[PDB]
Design a protein around this ligand. Structure first.
Ligand SMILES: [Mg+2]
Ligand SMILES: [Mg+2]
Ligand SMILES: [Mg+2]
Lengths: 196, 222, 125, 204, 195, 212, 222, 222, 196, 195
């Protein structure tokens, strides 16, 4: 995998490639690594497909039960539940998850959770095997309070490069836009992003 | 049985005439990747104690939550929570020391090296170390990781024994700490330029300094 | 688990459940033991309101606990099987650990201890 | 199967006022089994004395080798080899087997016949020279010998007093080691007389 | 432990078992009896891991004696052998299995027939005219394949057994310090003192 | 360690060395390897010092509880089996013990049982246990007769430990002697090998391998 | 071992401690770690003691022969080239870690060599188990344009850091000063801050204390 | 893989007189080649005229001392303030140690005090609880250096009466507290010279019928 | 290490950090990883310090002997000698070398030689542990026929990022300019490049 | 292989060596002579790795016989023992070392004295009044420490040797099938046929 999430003026956007791997064989070239845990709280999944799926399923269950009792959970709360699962089961898990959500009070927020189960709140986050190749690019190009179109271009260009160099990444670039307006799904095909 | 993932490097500290100083950089390393740069590794407990932590950051964040909870629990049914029955540095340490040794004895350690710096209610300086093995010790200067090898020798030139503590001012002590941090940036491959520093004085109290930078560096000599 | 304290003291200092258990013994068929200069004889009554019995297969009144010790009883027949079984198991357990069969005093002390335990344990009579 | 502790044994050397002493135990065993109580570990080539601890086959081999080399030295040089020179020869010979070494702990002792100066030296298995004013120790009870020597030793002891000090150093060290003991020999060395004494020690 | 043999003849079962108990480079004992009487007409010999052997033998002995007292009746050799097999079959999948191999020699009084059962630590049972455990079998089985007849007397069985012990004393690497021989027949269990 | 005990006409002799080792380091020369369970029972210790020490004093407590409960001193057979059944429960866990339970009772007479940490329990007349057991056997077996006098038997036991103390690197210190009769055990002194070796060498004429 | 090298105005200075160990045991309390390759080229060596001595002697021998062959004073880069190619050939199996320094017709020079065959260059260097304690001092107090007496002070201070703070280092400080135009000046035991205190008691025994079995005169003559 | 044990170095020593007993120990605490503290005491007054030290892995050492101190407290609570005799303390410590037979306290334990006849007593333990009363015992890193010296000077081993042909041994006698402290100080200075993990300071606890007294002496800091 | 070499209009520039590592201890913070094998043929060294030094020394000897007989060697020739040593001793070497030189006929040329000993001629090359983090940045920012000032900025910005993320990289940024004009050495200190 | 003993008395050296050759669970031979005559007054017994033992023994035998023919003279026992030690000392650092332990019993005709040398596969030589290789020494050394006197006769030495074999036959785990005994004295080497 290559995955990322980026905050901007109107909220936050999540991004991911679509490649699933078993050694050098691509088991699925149209994977959906962006997963809904709540209406406007989503996560990017990297690491083991089975581990990250089982975690996201448990989180979605927890937040559904939270909502039934206490109403809409904060993005911080969602990240805390991910952390609790990742930290307490660190010996048996291979999961690198980025949590991203939109509040109306807090606007866009991004939390990254690496292998150990630590939590880190950031303006933007990158993760997955392909992220290594874009640390330089992303640090140089990220600005705070970007527009929607600018943030889409930032993610598109970033994941394009990650895909170009990482063999474990490829296929389509999926994105999910989280704003006050609602939830928008975007897709970008090789013929567009490859020649950027 | 664990292996550390996201890690923090040296924590350094020393006693001076009226209190203690402690420092640690703001980096969260992921192996050789210098991944996170806004990480605070000094955590104050009340207005009289600062706990400095190195090692695994997920375990550090767990210890943060434990200390946060300890403050809450101490305040319960305690009218003197902000006076005679406030949390002492010695109480905070012994608690952590107990936890560290219990976890090592269950073969599932908290992968950390910890320094508790503070001032007791009677004015006495408190400075003591504890790690993943549950090993504890005290000294006029204390440091973890690379700090133990490079900072301690420098800090021991200022305070070499007990009798040197009354003769050392806060200006002289902070100067030695800040110098040691520069040396660590030169020589530790997992240090950052940015760091935090905390002074706990028996008169002026807790002073927490953020976003400090290593400066006045010598390179011009290749 | 069923916990009720069934054997308890009464105002006069008696444990009625233990005393009523003695009445069950009084109802049982007579048993007698006489020891001589070189032997012990155990005699037992068998009631004759039961004709058409098969004496080959009907449980005998005197039971061997080991090859050298015997146990007869008076009272509830079903209850006695539980004591006999426990005694027989302790007999073999003693031979196993001490490498010597039980003394008659020891075997008796064990059986009596079992009986006592059922007078101050919850949920049992 | 640690070559330096199959057979067992110890050697110690000390300096005094115009004299030197070198001592060793007599044990040769095969791990737990004691085999010989006559196995001496000190040899001499002219006035230069060499003690060797470690694997006994190498102790024997090296003695035979240094006898060989010092005999040729004397024939060519027309003089007896001195302790300082012999020390260098031992070092060279050991380092020649750098990646396949003799499993030994040799100790040189003697008095330079020209200057009259007492000289002692020690080596690791690979040739590193360890020079000392006071004492050199070697063998399976080296820790014990280090402790005994460091506390008992004082400078400029007379030959008769030095004998008592070195003997008590060896004896009490040997008795705290399972693989050392079974008898002992002490050499007291003056400028032109050498006295050899066998010590009475516990035989367990 | 090490050598345990068994031969079933016309009217009896004969068990021979080595007397040596060796630990390290020392023979600690040369008169060890590697057998337990389970019932008047049933004998069990055993060999295997130290401690395990006697612990298992005595545990089985206690259980069969308990049965005998409860029912006032002697279990058949076949029934005892099946009980022992099941105990070992349980044991093999335990946290720490009994590493014990046994032979069971018995005289069935209802059938008036001798019976010999061979059971290993896995719980592998077989009825045999002659049996052996461990390295002994590698010599004795072929020997008995040749010299054994089903209609032999107890005396003929003892001579056939002498032939086995002689072969083992000639070709086996270890000194097993001779054997204790015991006969199981209609009249119960008895020991041959001069072998 | 070296420890022995043998049966004879006049009862039981029990003899042990007194050395403790941690690898090649001689930790102690004055260890007590015989434990006095009661006036008629003795236990010998070989193997793990703590294992032996802890569980044999524990055994003593179990024997005391027997005579309180049964109003009779425990048999040597039953005492040995308590220990053997205990160590069998720990089989595989890593306990290291080579012990001998020696004593007299009316029903048994003089009796010796060998008990070790893999669960072996053996009755016998002669046993030697420990790293130096073979050295003790060599002397003991070649001089043993049933008809030895109390004086001669005591010496043979003492001499057999001395033999092992000398040859076995992990044996030594001193010899502790015990004699067990129908009336109970009798202590026959601590004998330092430092003096005993030279005394035996001179008086007996043996140990000719050593420089006199 | 602690060893350092420091460049100054008109030359270079190297220093070392004087403790030799076998495991945690101190074998020699005053061994000499400062070696001579040529009159004005000196080596400080850490690692396997026999390897440093043997490799320094071999190259020193070959340097002397080369000097005689070329009728020229030997250069530091020649010793550096020969040591590095020898050590590389043996793939680190010869455990010699050296600081090479000296003066020659080309000027004054300071290098270090690792066991596998890498050379380094610097104004200040440190090698050995106490190198981190020494380097901490060097990074703190070094400056461009040092005088002779300043460089000796800095070098010996860096060695002292190792002596006090590293368990692998101890006893005394040896120094060698190599100045351009002058003879190299070797200062054995330049500092002795670890003198053994007077013992409480004399352990001289009464004569006759040791039991003796046999006496005999040994023949050393022909 | 996580290793739950560590080695904190140092060494300890106990000697018993006729009406007194001493328990000494250096104040240095280490890991690998670094010093953690120059003054970290490891000899403790546990009450009832019993002094105790558990040397080796400090976390296990502190845990054991902590548990035994607690055992003394509860012994008073449960047995009408009865004084815990040294022989009873020894047996209690055996059970503390053997209780962790399959995950041992990595320490060498020595206790000192007076027996019930008023005479000096020293008991020593292995890591799993094997114990023995002695006149004399050294423990820890330098035990192998000190112990043979004690055999020679306290128990007069290998010392015969002069002129008696090695037939009459030097008679055993009790030593005065002045003589014992001389042996302790010489033992620790000798150990400091030849063992890297031993130094900094020496703390002796002396036990008489009047109580527990302390004496401190500087040791070499290299 | 982080190292790179870049061709441009007037020739080629080599770049490197100054960090030498032994575990997490910085053995040398002012290392010179840019090595002269000929007047206008230089190399960047990464991997084992001892292996790369021994190789560069042998190459320098070979090219000095080449020059004595056949005059100035081509940059391709220098790369071939590096390759021959790296390929034939692949089992015993840990060396990643970039070769860069200036001809007057061929202008600037860059050859990269990875672990296996293969040769690859490229417009620019990046190598060393820190290179992973700038694949994205360098691919997006490299143009052919840049000016001297542009190429210096490209290398300065690139190595700045590599240094920022790689713990095995740091210290100063050294550069060596190879043109018809001659050989120019440049150095850039932390206080400048860190705040880019 | 396994058991080889040696005793030096007043006027002779006596060597006892086990007769068994065992491979796996089979005693292949019970009359094996584990000795070679190196010269008329020098005998060498041997034990160790299969093949290596005889190959080494015969190689030494050839060399000493070659020496004897060349010089028309018999090497002293001391000289032969030193030659053998050096061959083993070379061997131990070879690609494949000789895993052979030897005892050398000889009578020095110039000194009129018996001599016994014990040498192991490492090349560790010692002169002894009595010697043993392998596990045998763990019993015999202590036995001989007690019963041996330096002034014993050959007959007394044989009785002392019977005492060793008896002890080994009692306490050793393996059946070594008795020993072949040979005496080395002023008149050369002879074999005792009834032992
Ligand atoms: Mg791809
Ligand atoms: Mg011994
Ligand atoms: Mg130091």
């Amino acid at each position: 995998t290559s995955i990322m999430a980026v905050t901007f003026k109107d909220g936050v956007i999540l991004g991911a490639d679509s490649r699933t791997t078993t050694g050098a064989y691509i088991a699925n070239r149209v994977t959906d690594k962006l997963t809904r845990v709540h209406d406007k709280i989503w996560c990017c999944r990297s690491g083991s497909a089975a581990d990250t799926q089982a975690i996201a399923d448990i989180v979605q269950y927890h937040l559904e039960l939270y909502t039934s009792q206490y109403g809409t959970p904060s993005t911080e709360t969602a990240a805390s539940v991910f952390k609790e699962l990742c930290y307490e089961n660190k010996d048996n898990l291979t999961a690198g998850i980025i949590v991203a959500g939109y509040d109306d009070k807090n606007k866009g927020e991004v939390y990254t959770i690496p292998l150990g189960g630590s939590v880190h709140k950031l303006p933007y986050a990158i993760a997955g095997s392909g992220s290594t190749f874009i640390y330089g690019y992303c640090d140089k190009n990220f600005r705070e309070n970007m527009s929607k179109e600018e943030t889409v271009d930032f993610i598109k260009h970033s994941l394009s490069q990650a895909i170009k160099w990482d063999g474990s990444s490829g296929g389509v670039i999926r994105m999910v836009v989280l704003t006050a307006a609602g939830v928008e799904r975007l897709i970008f095909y090789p013929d567009e992003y490859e020649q950027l | 049985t664990q292996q550390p993932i996201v890690t923090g490097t040296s924590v350094i500290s020393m006693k001076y005439d009226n209190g203690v100083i402690i420092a640690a950089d703001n980096l969260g390393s992921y192996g050789s990747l210098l991944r996170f740069n806004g990480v605070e590794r000094l955590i104050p407990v009340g207005d009289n104690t600062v706990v400095g932590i190195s090692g695994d950051i997920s375990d550090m964040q767990h210890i943060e939550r434990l200390l946060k909870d300890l403050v809450t629990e101490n305040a319960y049914d305690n009218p003197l929570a902000d006076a005679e029955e406030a949390l002492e540095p010695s109480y905070i340490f012994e608690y952590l020391a107990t936890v560290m040794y219990q976890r090592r004895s269950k073969m599932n350690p908290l992968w950390n090296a910890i320094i508790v710096a503070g001032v007791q209610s009677n004015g006495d300086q408190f400075l003591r170390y504890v790690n993943l093995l549950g090993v504890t010790y005290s000294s006029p200067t204390l440091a973890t990781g690379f700090g133990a090898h490079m900072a301690n020798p420098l800090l021991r030139k200022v305070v070499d024994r007990e009798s040197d503590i009354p003769k050392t001012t806060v200006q002289v002590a902070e100067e030695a700490i800040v110098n040691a941090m520069r040396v660590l940036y030169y020589r530790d491959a997992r240090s950052s330029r940015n760091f935090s520093l905390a002074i706990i004085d028996k008169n002026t109290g807790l002073t927490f300094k953020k976003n400090l930078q290593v400066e006045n560096m010598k390179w011009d000599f290749a | 688990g069923y916990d009720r304290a069934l054997s308890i003291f009464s105002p006069d200092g008696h444990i009625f459940q233990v005393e009523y258990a003695l009445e069950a013994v009084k109802r049982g068929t007579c048993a007698v033991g006489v020891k001589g200069k070189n032997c012990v004889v155990l005699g037992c009554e068998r009631r004759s309101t039961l004709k058409l019995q098969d004496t080959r297969i009907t449980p005998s009144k005197v039971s061997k606990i080991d090859s050298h010790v015997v146990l007869s009883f008076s009272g509830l027949n079903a209850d006695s099987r539980i004591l006999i079984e426990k005694a027989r198991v302790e007999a073999q357990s003693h031979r196993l650990t001490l490498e010597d069969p039980v003394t008659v005093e020891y075997l008796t002390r064990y059986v009596a201890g079992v009986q006592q335990r059922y007078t101050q344990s919850g949920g049992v009579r | 199967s640690d070559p330096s502790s199959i057979n067992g044994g110890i050697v110690v050397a000390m300096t005094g006022k115009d004299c030197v002493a070198i001592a060793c135990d007599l044990r040769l065993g095969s791990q737990s089994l004691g085999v010989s109580n006559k196995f001496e570990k000190i040899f001499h080539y002219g006035h230069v004395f060499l003690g060797i601890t470690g694997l006994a086959t190498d102790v024997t081999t090296l003695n035979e080798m240094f006898r060989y080399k010092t005999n040729l030295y004397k024939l060519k040089e027309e003089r007896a080899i001195e302790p300082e020179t012999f020390t260098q020869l031992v070092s060279s010979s050991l380092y020649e087997r750098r990646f396949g070494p003799y499993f030994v702990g040799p100790v040189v002792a003697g008095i330079n016949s020209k200057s009259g100066k007492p000289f002692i030296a020690g080596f690791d298995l690979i040739g590193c020279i360890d020079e000392a004013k006071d004492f050199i120790v070697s063998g399976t009870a080296s820790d014990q010998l280090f402790g005994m020597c460091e506390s008992l030793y004082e400078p400029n002891l007379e030959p008769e007093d030095l004998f008592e000090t070195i003997s008590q150093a060896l004896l009490n060290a040997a008795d705290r080691d399972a693989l050392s003991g079974w008898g002992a020999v002490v050499y007291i060395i003056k400028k032109d007389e050498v006295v050899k004494r066998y010590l009475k020690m516990r035989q367990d | 432990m090490d050598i345990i043999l068994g031969i079933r003849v016309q009217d009896s079962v004969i068990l021979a078992s080595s007397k040596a108990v060796t630990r390290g480079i020392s023979v600690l004992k040369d008169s060890d009896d590697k057998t337990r009487q389970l019932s008047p007409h049933t004998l069990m010999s055993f060999a295997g891991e130290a401690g395990d052997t006697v612990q298992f033998a005595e545990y089985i002995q206690a259980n069969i004696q308990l049965y005998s007292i409860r029912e006032d009746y002697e279990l058949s050799p076949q029934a005892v052998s099946s009980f022992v097999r099941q105990e070992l079959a349980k044991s093999i999948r335990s946290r720490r299995p009994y590493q014990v191999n046994v032979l069971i020699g018995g005289y069935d009084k209802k059938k008036n027939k001798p019976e010999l059962y061979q059971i290993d630590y896995l719980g592998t049972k077989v009825e045999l005219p002659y049996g052996a455990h461990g390295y002994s079998g590698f010599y004795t089985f072929s020997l008995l394949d040749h010299h054994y007849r089903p209609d032999m007397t107890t005396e003929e069985g003892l001579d056939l057994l002498k032939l086995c012990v002689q072969e083992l004393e000639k070709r086996m690497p270890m000194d097993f310090k001779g054997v204790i021989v015991k006969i199981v027949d209609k009249d119960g269990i008895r020991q041959v003192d001069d072998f | 360690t070296t420890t022995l005990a043998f049966r004879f006409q006049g009862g039981i002799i029990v003899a042990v060395d007194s050395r403790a080792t941690a690898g090649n380091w001689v930790a102690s020369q004055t260890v007590k390897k015989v434990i006095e369970i009661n006036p008629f029972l003795l236990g010998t210790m070989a193997g793990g010092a703590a294992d032996c020490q802890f569980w044999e004093t524990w055994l003593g407590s179990q024997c005391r509880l027997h005579e309180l409960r049964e109003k009779e001193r425990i048999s040597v057979a039953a005492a040995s089996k308590i220990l053997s059944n205990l160590v069998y429960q720990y089989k595989g866990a890593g306990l290291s013990m080579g012990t001998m339970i020696c004593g007299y009772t009316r029903k048994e007479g003089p009796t010796i049982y060998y008990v070790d940490s893999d669960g072996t329990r053996l009755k016998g007349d002669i046993f030697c246990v420990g790293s130096g057991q073979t050295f003790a056997y060599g002397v003991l077996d070649s001089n043993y007769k049933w008809d030895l006098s109390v004086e001669d038997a005591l010496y043979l036991g003492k001499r057999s430990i001395l033999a092992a103390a000398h040859r076995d690197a992990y044996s030594g210190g001193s010899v502790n002697l015990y004699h067990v009769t129908e009336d109970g055990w009798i202590y026959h002194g601590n004998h330092d090998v430092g003096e005993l070796f030279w005394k035996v060498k001179e008086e007996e004429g043996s140990f000719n391998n050593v420089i006199g | 071992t602690t060893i350092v090298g420091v460049k100054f105005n008109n030359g270079v200075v190297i220093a070392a401690d004087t403790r030799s160990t076998q495991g945690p045991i101190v074998a020699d309390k005053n061994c000499a770690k400062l070696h001579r390759i040529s009159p004005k080229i000196w080596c400080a060596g850490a690692g396997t003691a026999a390897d440093t001595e043997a490799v320094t002697q071999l190259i020193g021998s070959n340097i002397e022969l080369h000097s005689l062959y070329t009728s020229r004073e030997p250069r530091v880069v020649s010793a550096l080239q020969m040591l590095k190619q020898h050590l590389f050939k043996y793939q680190g199996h010869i455990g010699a870690y050296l600081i090479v320094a000296g003066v020659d017709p080309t000027g004054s020079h300071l290098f270090s060599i690792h066991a596998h065959g890498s050379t380094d260059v610097g104004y200040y260097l440190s090698l050995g188990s106490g190198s981190l304690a020494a380097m901490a001092v060097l990074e703190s107090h070094w400056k461009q344009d040092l005088t002779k007496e300043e460089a000796i002070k800095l070098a010996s201070d860096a060695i002292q850091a190792g002596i006090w703070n590293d368990l692998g280092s101890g006893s005394n400080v040896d120094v060698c000063v190599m100045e351009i135009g002058k003879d190299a000046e070797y200062l054995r035991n330049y500092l002795t801050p670890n003198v053994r205190e007077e013992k409480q008691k004399s352990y001289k025994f009464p004569r006759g204390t040791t039991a003796v079995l046999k006496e005999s005169i040994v023949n050393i003559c022909d | 893989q996580f290793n739950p044990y560590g080695d904190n170095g140092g060494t300890i020593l106990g000697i018993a007189g006729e009406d007194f007993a001493v328990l000494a120990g250096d104040t240095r605490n280490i890991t690998d080649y670094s010093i953690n503290s120059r003054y970290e005491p490891k000899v403790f007054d546990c009450g009832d005229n019993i002094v105790m030290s558990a040397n080796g892995f400090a976390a296990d050492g502190d845990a054991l001392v902590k548990r035994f101190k607690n055992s003394v407290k509860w012994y008073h609570f449960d047995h009408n303030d009865k004084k815990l005799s040294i022989n009873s303390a020894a047996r209690n410590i055996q059970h503390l140690l053997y209780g962790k037979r399959f995950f041992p306290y990595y320490v060498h334990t020595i206790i000192a005090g007076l027996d019930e006849d008023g005479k000096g007593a020293v008991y020593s333990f292995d890591p799993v609880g094997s114990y023995e009363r002695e006149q004399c015992r050294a423990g820890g890193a330098a035990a192998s250096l000190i112990m043979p010296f004690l055999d020679n000077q306290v128990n007069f081993k290998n010392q015969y009466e002069p002129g008696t042909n090695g037939k009459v041994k030097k008679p055993l006698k009790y030593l005065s507290v002045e003589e014992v402290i001389k042996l302790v100080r010489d033992s620790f200075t000798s150990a400091t010279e030849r063992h890297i993990q031993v130094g900094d300071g020496l703390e002796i606890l002396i036990v008489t019928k009047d109580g527990v007294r302390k004496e401190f002496y500087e040791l070499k800091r290299d």
